[PDB]
């Protein structure tokens, strides 16, 4: 039921400058004019925020250039939009955006927000299809243009809407909406702010903190996300294709969070009025070291410089007696089963790797200790016992067995530590 919408656009996305945006209250603890430093996931100051042009219209006969990509979700995102219309609905978050993995869906319509964690079957170009009544009142909004099926549905939440229009807006002003999403320790936290600005090409120069909206208890693995856009049905064509849906203009700003240290200056009412990001530049590191916004002339010790070391060179001595096992594992005549042999291997250099990987052994079981960690341990004595048995009697050489061999020929204690090795020898020991 879903549509191919994506037209290939040669133009790359632009880049703007997040001057000082995307700061939030990282906790519920009233403060009053206390300069507080906090290490958390924040958007860095003067960073490189990508300006995505979604649906955009050029006038020749009317051409929309749909391009709405799936973006990574590294550690949380900062999302921003100056949209007069209602073209930005919620988002989809997930790992595969397919079946066999759970996904999260946030949808805002005109009176509620609905949030579902479920097992969706999203299409290649998901959107929200809106229908009207010729008096421009709403008729229905089909979510089956987003997904084709939605089963095994775990979480559902519904409340007052996240984003509202507020058109009019005092004449000529624009409404910037900012959101911060982060998914940590099984919780999904959303922060939001709405701010009025005038006709600027970019993000403004001021300062505005972000109050938290919701902390959804999900436990979802998120690595990718995508934005939902609303398209209206055209009614001037019977088909469902890309010519059958009309759209306005949509654009947004996406930046990524990073773990930084921020010095926040609170107000007496409990309002973050300004802040600064430590690191970044030196001056700021001094302000953070002093816990102030004005440093007086002087000289200040601010941190330390420590060269970094690469690679780890492990020196050692050569090797001589690498154990000639090639006497017990390479004998011309073995020993009976009722009088087994007993060699007491002693001080040397044992290389159980030449054994473990020789692939000539039909049975190599290790009991006290898994095989790969033998060439990394040291003991007092190794004993090696040798004998010859039938083929199907090799299962009685193990701790805690019974049978004519383990009963009275050769018994292994019940807390054995070594390993048992066995290989077929039909051509050497059997004679016509």
């Amino acid at each position, epitope marked *: 039921q879903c549509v191919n919408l994506t037209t290939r656009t040669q133009l790359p996305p632009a880049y703007t400058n997040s001057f000082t945006r995307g700061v939030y209250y990282p906790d519920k603890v009233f403060r009053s004019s206390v300069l507080h430093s906090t290490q958390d996931l924040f958007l860095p100051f003067f960073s490189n925020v990508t300006w995505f042009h979604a649906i955009h219209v050029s006038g020749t006969n009317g051409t929309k250039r749909f391009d709405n990509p799936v973006l990574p979700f590294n550690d949380g995102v900062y999302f921003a939009s100056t949209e007069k219309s209602n073209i930005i609905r919620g988002w989809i978050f997930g790992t595969t955006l397919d079946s066999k993995t759970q996904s999260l869906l946030i949808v805002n319509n005109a009176t509620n927000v609905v949030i579902k964690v479920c097992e969706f079957q999203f299409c290649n170009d998901p959107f929200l299809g809106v*229908y009207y*009544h010729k008096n421009n009142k709403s008729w229905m909004e089909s979510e089956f243009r987003v997904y084709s099926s939605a089963n095994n549905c775990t979480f559902e939440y519904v409340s007052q809407p996240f984003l509202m229009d507020l058109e009019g807006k005092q004449g000529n002003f624009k409404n910037l909406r900012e959101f911060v999403f982060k998914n940590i320790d099984g919780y999904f936290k959303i922060y939001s702010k709405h701010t009025p600005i005038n006709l600027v090409r970019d993000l403004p120069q001021g300062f505005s903190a972000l109050e938290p909206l919701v902390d959804l208890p999900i436990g979802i693995n998120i690595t990718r996300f995508q934005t939902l856009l609303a398209l209206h*049905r055209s*009614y*001037l064509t*019977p*088909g*469902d294709s890309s010519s059958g849906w009309t759209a306005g203009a949509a654009a947004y700003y996406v930046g990524y969070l990073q773990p930084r240290t921020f010095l926040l200056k609170y107000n007496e009412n409990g309002t973050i009025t300004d802040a600064v990001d430590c690191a970044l530049d030196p001056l700021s590191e001094t302000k953070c070291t002093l816990k102030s916004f004005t440093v007086e002339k002087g000289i200040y010790q601010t941190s330390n410089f420590r060269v970094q070391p690469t690679e780890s060179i492990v020196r050692f001595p050569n090797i001589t007696n690498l154990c000639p096992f090639g006497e017990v594992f390479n004998a011309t005549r073995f020993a009976s089963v009722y009088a087994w042999n007993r060699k007491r291997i002693s001080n040397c250099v044992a290389d159980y790797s030449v054994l473990y990987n020789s692939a000539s052994f039909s049975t190599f079981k290790c009991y006290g200790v898994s095989p790969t960690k033998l060439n990394d341990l040291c003991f007092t004595n190794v004993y090696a016992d040798s004998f010859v048995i039938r083929g199907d009697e090799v299962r009685q050489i193990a701790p805690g067995q019974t049978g004519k061999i383990a009963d009275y020929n050769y018994k292994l204690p019940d807390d054995f530590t070594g390993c048992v090795i066995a290989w077929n020898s039909n051509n050497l020991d059997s004679k016509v």
Partner: antibody
Amino acid sequence: QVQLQQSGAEVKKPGASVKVSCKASGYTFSRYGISWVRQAPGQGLEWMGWISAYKGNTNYAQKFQGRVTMTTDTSTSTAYMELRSLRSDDTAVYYCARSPPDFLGWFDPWGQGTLVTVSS
Amino acid sequence: LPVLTQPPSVSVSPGQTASITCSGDKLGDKFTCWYQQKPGQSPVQVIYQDTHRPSGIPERFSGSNSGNTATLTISGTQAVDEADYYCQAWDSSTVIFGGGTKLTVLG
């Protein structure tokens, strides 16, 4: 280029049931809908109902509610309409039009129509 | 039912403009289509959504819809524009067809 071929000139008795078929060719049948329109001889058009070819999704008029059943078959790409409990007053010409998959308009190509005559 | 009332016959001499009026109640919140059916054939859509005309229909059919009446207008009526003309109104729930209107090029 698009094409809707109907079938039959059936003659029934009062009380029987009739099934009319309409086969499409020239376009993707799975992404549209079929609506049925009646016309009594010498009278105006009547709307019977509509089906979407994606997944069932009928819509009947209240005059024919409980009497008509419309089905599709996208493997052979035909549409069927079955009327039950026929009587005189139902002898007419039945038309098959290609409507959109939603929003219930656009009776564009109009397959040639079958005359169903009841009586005895 | 908002049932559309439409006059049964409109007579026009060859070379004038014909005006067919489909008047029903409300009809301002509904889209109206106009269909043409020649005698002995299947109907042909000539106006779909309130003054919109498909390709292949010549540049003399013009629709209109304002208030409680819809109007089809043919300018320069030839002898080939002699058929029945039906008015149709749809909304989110149902579809209503009007009565006929036999147009005649007074010969």
